Amino acid sequence: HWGYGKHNGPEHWHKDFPIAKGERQSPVDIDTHTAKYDPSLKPLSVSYDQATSLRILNNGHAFNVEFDDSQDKAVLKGGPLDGTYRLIQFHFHWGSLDGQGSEHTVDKKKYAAELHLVHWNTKYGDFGKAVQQPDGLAVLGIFLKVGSAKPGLQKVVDVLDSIKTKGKSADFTNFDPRGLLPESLDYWTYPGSLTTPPLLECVTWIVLKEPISVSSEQVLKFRKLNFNGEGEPEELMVDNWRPAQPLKNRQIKASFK
């Protein structure tokens, strides 16, 4: 029964998930001046041309756009990664206000939201096995700032009315996640964790430097979602972000100067 409220939010999670206090937790603050340029980091290879979206689900914590990950259709390779990582889902974290919502921060700056494209290492066969491995997942994180609309986001925005409450899903086929990416694939990378329980330390984080712009109306629609199920008192789905965790014995690497 974890969540984002005063009595079950991030400061409480450690009681049920003691790895919350572990050595490689996420998110973190990205101190841009202390990140180390690593010229041997390769360009990211984002291969989403054959991506097959299936469904969108309100899980009571966020909404997930799910993909067919039973073949190498949408994969992430390159960068800091060895091998092939299949896209399973994407989701966002966002705030009640435009000045908060991201999980990662950049020189302590918070963005209005953060997109997470979640991928798992095919050598482990399935996501459940991958999350038990230190190199099991690769999450591509993209910041959202409020300004001009993101045309490639609007099909997601438009369906949210149909998944207002926890447990609701809708068909969501033929969505092209390439429409969510910024122009540049410059990134920061570090070893971390899932940012929600069970907080497993299985993630290679790849956080893009360049934010995408979304409109105020687009993020306002995110904020009309509900944490609660249908027929329960309304709890707006806002502030579903974990704050930055201690970096501990990690160095953030940059792909760019």
What span, in angstroms and rounded, lies between the C-alpha atoms of 122 and 15? 32
Q: Is 150 in the site for Zn ion (CB under 5 A)?
A: no
Q: Tell me the closest approach of the beta carbon of residue 195 to ligand AZM, in angstroms.
A: 4
Residues 91-120 that bind ligand AZM (CB under 6 A): 106, 116, 118
HSE-CB at 67 with a 13 A cutoff on CA atoms is 26
* 3-class DSSP state of 114: strand
Asked if 69 contacts 87 with a C-beta cutoff of 8 angstroms, the reply is yes
List the x/- string, 29-68, binding to ligand AZM by CB under 6 A: ----------------------------------------
Within 10 angstroms of residue 89's Cβ, the number of other Cβ atoms is 22
What span, in angstroms and rounded, lies between the C-alpha atoms of 140 and 212? 13
Phi and psi angles of residue 122, each rounded to the nearest 5 degrees, phi first? -65, -20
Q: Tell me the closest approach of the beta carbon of residue 67 to Zn ion, in angstroms.
A: 15
Within 10 angstroms of residue 68's Cβ, the number of other Cβ atoms is 16
* Structure letter (DSSP) for residue 222: H
Which does residue 221 touch among Zn ion, ligand AZM, none (CB within 5 to 8 A, set by kind)? none
Closer of 8 and 122 to ligand AZM (Cβ): 8
User: Among the candidate windows 7-15, 70-78, 167-175, 220-228, which touches ligand AZM by CB under 6 A?
Assistant: 7-15
Q: Is 119 in the site for Zn ion (CB under 5 A)?
A: no
Q: Tell me the closest approach of the beta carbon of residue 254 to ligand AZM, in angstroms.
A: 10
Residues annotated in a binding site for Zn(2+): 91, 93, 116
List active site positions.
61
